[PDB]
Amino acid sequence: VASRVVVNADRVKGTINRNIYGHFSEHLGRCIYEGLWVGEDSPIPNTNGIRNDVLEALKQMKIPVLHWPGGCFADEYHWKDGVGPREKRKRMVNTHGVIENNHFGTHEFMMLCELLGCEPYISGNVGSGTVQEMSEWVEYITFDGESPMANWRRENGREKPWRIKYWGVGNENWGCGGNMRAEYYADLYRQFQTYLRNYGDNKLHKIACGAWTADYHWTEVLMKQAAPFMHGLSLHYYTVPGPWEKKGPATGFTTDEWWVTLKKALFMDELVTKHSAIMDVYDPDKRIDLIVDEWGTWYDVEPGTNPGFLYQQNSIRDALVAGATLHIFHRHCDRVRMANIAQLVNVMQSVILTEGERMLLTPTYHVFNMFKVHQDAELLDTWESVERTGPEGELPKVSVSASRAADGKIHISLCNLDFETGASVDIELRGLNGGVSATGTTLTSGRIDGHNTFDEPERVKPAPFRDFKLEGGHLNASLPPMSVTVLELTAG
Amino acid sequence: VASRVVVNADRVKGTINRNIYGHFSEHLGRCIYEGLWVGEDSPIPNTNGIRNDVLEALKQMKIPVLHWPGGCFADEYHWKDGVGPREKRKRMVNTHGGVIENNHFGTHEFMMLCELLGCEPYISGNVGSGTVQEMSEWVEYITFDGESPMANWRRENGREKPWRIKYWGVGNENWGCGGNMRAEYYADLYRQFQTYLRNYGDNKLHKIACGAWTADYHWTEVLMKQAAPFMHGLSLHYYTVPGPWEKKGPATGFTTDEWWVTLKKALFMDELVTKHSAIMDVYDPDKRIDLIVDEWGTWYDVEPGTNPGFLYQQNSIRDALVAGATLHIFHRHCDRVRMANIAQLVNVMQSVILTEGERMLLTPTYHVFNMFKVHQDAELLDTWESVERTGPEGELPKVSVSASRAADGKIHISLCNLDFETGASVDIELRGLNGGVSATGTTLTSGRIDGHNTFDEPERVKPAPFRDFKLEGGHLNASLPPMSVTVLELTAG
Amino acid sequence: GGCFADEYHWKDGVGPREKRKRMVNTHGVIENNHFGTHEFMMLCELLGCEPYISGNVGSGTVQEMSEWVEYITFDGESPMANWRRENGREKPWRIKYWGVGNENWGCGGNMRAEYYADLYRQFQTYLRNYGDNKLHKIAC
Numbered sequence A: 001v002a003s004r005v006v007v008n009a010d011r012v013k014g015t016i017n018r019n020i021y022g023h024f025s026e027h028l029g030r031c032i033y034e035g036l037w038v039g040e041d042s043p044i045p046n047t048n049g050i051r052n053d054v055l056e057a058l059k060q061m062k063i064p065v066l067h068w069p070g071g072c073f074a075d076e077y078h079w080k081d082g083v084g085p086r087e088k089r090k091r092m093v094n095t096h097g098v099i100e101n102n103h104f105g106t107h108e109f110m111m112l113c114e115l116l117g118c119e120p121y122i123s124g125n126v127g128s129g130t131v132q133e134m135s136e137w138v139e140y141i142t143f144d145g146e147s148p149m150a151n152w153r154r155e156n157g158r159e160k161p162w163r164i165k166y167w168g169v170g171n172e173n174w175g176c177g178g179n180m181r182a183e184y185y186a187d188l189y190r191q192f193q194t195y196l197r198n199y200g201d202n203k204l205h206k207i208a209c210g211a212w213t214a215d216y217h218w219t220e221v222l223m224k225q226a227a228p229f230m231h232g233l234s235l236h237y238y239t240v241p242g243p244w245e246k247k248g249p250a251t252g253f254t255t256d257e258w259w260v261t262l263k264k265a266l267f268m269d270e271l272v273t274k275h276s277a278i279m280d281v282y283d284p285d286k287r288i289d290l291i292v293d294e295w296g297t298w299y300d301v302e303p304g305t306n307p308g309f310l311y312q313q314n315s316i317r318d319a320l321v322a323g324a325t326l327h328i329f330h331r332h333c334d335r336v337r338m339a340n341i342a343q344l345v346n347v348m349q350s351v352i353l354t355e356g357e358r359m360l361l362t363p364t365y366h367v368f369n370m371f372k373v374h375q376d377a378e379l380l381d382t383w384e385s386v387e388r389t390g391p392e393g394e395l396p397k398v399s400v401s402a403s404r405a406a407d408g409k410i411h412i413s414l415c416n417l418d419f420e421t422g423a424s425v426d427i428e429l430r431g432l433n434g435g436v437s438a439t440g441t442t443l444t445s446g447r448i449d450g451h452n453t454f455d456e457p458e459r460v461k462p463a464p465f466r467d468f469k470l471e472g473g474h475l476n477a478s479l480p481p482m483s484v485t486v487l488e489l490t491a492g
Numbered sequence B: 001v002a003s004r005v006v007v008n009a010d011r012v013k014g015t016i017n018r019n020i021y022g023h024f025s026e027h028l029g030r031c032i033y034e035g036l037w038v039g040e041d042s043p044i045p046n047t048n049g050i051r052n053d054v055l056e057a058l059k060q061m062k063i064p065v066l067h068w069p070g071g072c073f074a075d076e077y078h079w080k081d082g083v084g085p086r087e088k089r090k091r092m093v094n095t096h097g098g099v100i101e102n103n104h105f106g107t108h109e110f111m112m113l114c115e116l117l118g119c120e121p122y123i124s125g126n127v128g129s130g131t132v133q134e135m136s137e138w139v140e141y142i143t144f145d146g147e148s149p150m151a152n153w154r155r156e157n158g159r160e161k162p163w164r165i166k167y168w169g170v171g172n173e174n175w176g177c178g179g180n181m182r183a184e185y186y187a188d189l190y191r192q193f194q195t196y197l198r199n200y201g202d203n204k205l206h207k208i209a210c211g212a213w214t215a216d217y218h219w220t221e222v223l224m225k226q227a228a229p230f231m232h233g234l235s236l237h238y239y240t241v242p243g244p245w246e247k248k249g250p251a252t253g254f255t256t257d258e259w260w261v262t263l264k265k266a267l268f269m270d271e272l273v274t275k276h277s278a279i280m281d282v283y284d285p286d287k288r289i290d291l292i293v294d295e296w297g298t299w300y301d302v303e304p305g306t307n308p309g310f311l312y313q314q315n316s317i318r319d320a321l322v323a324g325a326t327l328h329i330f331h332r333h334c335d336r337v338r339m340a341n342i343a344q345l346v347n348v349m350q351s352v353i354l355t356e357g358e359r360m361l362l363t364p365t366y367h368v369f370n371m372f373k374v375h376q377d378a379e380l381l382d383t384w385e386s387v388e389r390t391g392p393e394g395e396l397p398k399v400s401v402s403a404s405r406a407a408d409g410k411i412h413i414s415l416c417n418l419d420f421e422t423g424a425s426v427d428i429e430l431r432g433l434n435g436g437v438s439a440t441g442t443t444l445t446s447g448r449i450d451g452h453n454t455f456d457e458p459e460r461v462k463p464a465p466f467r468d469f470k471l472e473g474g475h476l477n478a479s480l481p482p483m484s485v486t487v488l489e490l491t492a493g
Numbered sequence C: 001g002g003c004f005a006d007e008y009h010w011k012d013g014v015g016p017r018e019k020r021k022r023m024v025n026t027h028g029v030i031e032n033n034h035f036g037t038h039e040f041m042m043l044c045e046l047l048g049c050e051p052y053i054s055g056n057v058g059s060g061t062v063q064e065m066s067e068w069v070e071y072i073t074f075d076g077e078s079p080m081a082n083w084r085r086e087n088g089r090e091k092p093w094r095i096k097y098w099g100v101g102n103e104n105w106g107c108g109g110n111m112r113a114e115y116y117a118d119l120y121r122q123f124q125t126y127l128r129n130y131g132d133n134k135l136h137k138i139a140c
């Protein structure tokens, strides 16, 4: 009982925008402080106050875009608090022990993006901010002439303006960003965006706040009232295994929790399909990007940690959620052009966890790093007929995607969602000229909650994958249980 | 500069419902009277009052469904006027150049016509000027197998057992000649009327709500949002009209600009179907509800000297291309479009048949339906294409292509060449085959841009064997004639 | 009714009992209309209870409902009141409780409230108080 797949290697169905592989860092818990920003004279080795171990890991992963500063924090932030002499910035401390000293602000974020080579994506404050304030932020960042804002930027140490495309006009406006009706947010959106200018040769890509989960009415109102004034519309969807008040743990979970988690993750396909169908009615040429800028798993925090800091472990279950979710974005790459997993470090479904100077790479990191070959690749036409798995055959056993990279290699990625047995897959390759050869890598575990710890940071990591044969133009593979695999094919 | 196509012969994308090949006959002009119904004692040879030359042609074409009685006539018709003893049927005669509706063709004659043809009946009830009880009683008259005044009347009138009928239109053209209704108002009437249309015995109704005219997307949105749970199908109406309303242009003797405009307006169907279907997707993402394109086709000025009210127009190779390209568009949308009905069957608009007393002819449109019948209930195959352009600014595709697999495993590939000036080279690669294949072909073409059939010369434009292709291995290279519709039949093994 | 009320045509249940409308469904239900308006009004008189009749909005007409009230309650000369007298009830009956349709959101026409409200307002307009009868109009 093999799954079967045909790849039409000569038939391109679209481009997987590299920004599908995006990330998100809020001023929350240890995502910014400790996770990234340590300060210049921290004993943690760093470049301009940003820790080097994280920088190198993220550069290796080819991080394409980073969204900051939130999240809920964005519609509470006043950006002027985070610029100027670092020592005189605004400080807040709540003992009920959270500290925001604003040492990481606009200059530090823009520097971080330059060091990583990624695009900045900033969310401005609609909920508690003013139109002038947001307009001035853009001017501060991008204007090259003389004005109070651009002069202030130069005094603060950046002589030439920066470039920025991605600009969120508020975030989470239906909830923590002002508890707004869609019709009211649409009006504020139209007003605020009006004053966000393109200075010099910078071109903004304005993004309106989109729906939470299955709020289709939100998407309809925003498209109907504001489509001509946006470049992009967001969408937020978290995979939460249990109920809100008892979500379940990141490790030590039951087999039922495995199946539920994956089934909830796959709901993304229905969401994206239905939101995109509404977008099609108002924007049939697909001008406007759909931006899935919050996704990932959300569990109860690790026992004994502060629930407000959202610290959770990351297992092979999380790797499968990431791999299957990225595949869903690939299938929707005609409309989805950016996505941002929540969140980068020490918060929710992170690629990295830190503990002082130590860090580890999660199983989620390994998926992003293995799948980077799909960034800006051409999606190829594939068709499939796959075994079922799970309690009632409710899940596909295998998720598969194929793309062609700019040097002509083909990458095929495969997730096996069953933790109990391996998955046979037969792949036929059509439309090739040459013969091809293949190598592979696989990420798997011997436990359903296999994870990395600071003491054992390499229990779950990629390994060479050799359990396939390629005879002519069939590639038959035996995927391990609970695994994510990538095959690289070279022609000639 | 060949157009290129790849057919994945092992990859099925959908089923082309046979009802895509449907037809439409209104009580208008000579579509019903003379076109079909001549009366039992006519010297025109006939079967129970229906002329035999038309019956045989329509059976050969494998007509799958026939919509009656309208059109605008349906929201004016009171069905009880069309049953019972012929001499007590309602009679209307207008001298203002003369028009007779004697109701000799009514419910029993229509159902007989469908049984003779082997096609499904599709009846449109009267919402605009009718009542809820009236429509309910029509369904009961036709379908109930028990005892009641309606079922007993049907038995008195000569049909003992009930008929089966699926397709039932709850009003027609309600935005215009069926009551000038706002969508919100129609949707409420629709919900009310449909409530009383019952499934008697083992009959199952397929209730169809009146859908949009052309690009009235608001109509589709309101009907889907207010009435989707109460319908099985939603209609759509789009005519290809070359010129303005007041001067549409002629069926023959037209300019080359009129050729290009005609075809470009026909292809607009694709955008309409796409956009209406997108709205349907929002409210019915599983595609339960059928899209029913129950009026389409060309509409020209009438033939000079004929009554404009009778809608009589000629039919040329231009009309064949419209039909072939439009059917291909329906194939591409066969995941949602499950019926279509070209307007109209005989002597009216884009007809398959024209008659003149006892003589008849088959139009170029007939030949397309008759050639493309191999696509009825076939499996649509995955094809991809990269085609030359044609027309003044390369605004048109030179070629339209569709492939399907029939129940016996043969593959049919149909191809339209939209350029009247030169032939079209097409290279087709076949993937996913086991055996070798061989191929035969037929083509419909003309030497003139307005080539048509007349009663004196009824065979100027008709299908012929097509041999101008080679099949080496799994490439099929073809040279399509100018202004042509072609079908290739491939047999494997 | 019930669902039957927005399918009933009251004229089917009056006149010589033997010539009333008959329906039979073998899939074995029989409606011979032997129990109609006169029989119901008699039943209420025998029991000493008030009659409460539901008229047909969903598949009925405004005139039909208006004529039902007139048939039952008018004491003068008209086609409806004369028909009542021929059918054996010389003086009119009294009736208060009159339902203007039933179950109109479902089996009585699958109506939106806003649409039923408009039909309600239209139908009720023509339900008159004849002689000393006073109707008590009930909306679904």
Ligand SMILES: OC[C@@H]1O[C@@H](O)[C@H](O)[C@H]1O
Binding pocket: A026, A070, A071, A072, A073, A172, A294, A342, A343, A348
């Ligand atoms: O990952 C972001 C979390 O969810 C969002 O609602 C808030 O920013 C934070 O609480």
Ligand SMILES: OC[C@@H]1O[C@@H](O)[C@H](O)[C@H]1O
Binding pocket: B026, B070, B071, B072, B073, B173, B295, B343, B344, B349
């Ligand atoms: O197809 C027939 C014409 O178009 C329809 O709209 C009317 O019935 C008639 O005038």
Ligand SMILES: OC[C@@H]1O[C@@H](O)[C@H](O)[C@H]1O
Binding pocket: C001, C002, C003, C004, C103
């Ligand atoms: O008691 C009445 C029942 O419920 C109502 O909906 C119908 O009249 C009948 O089916």
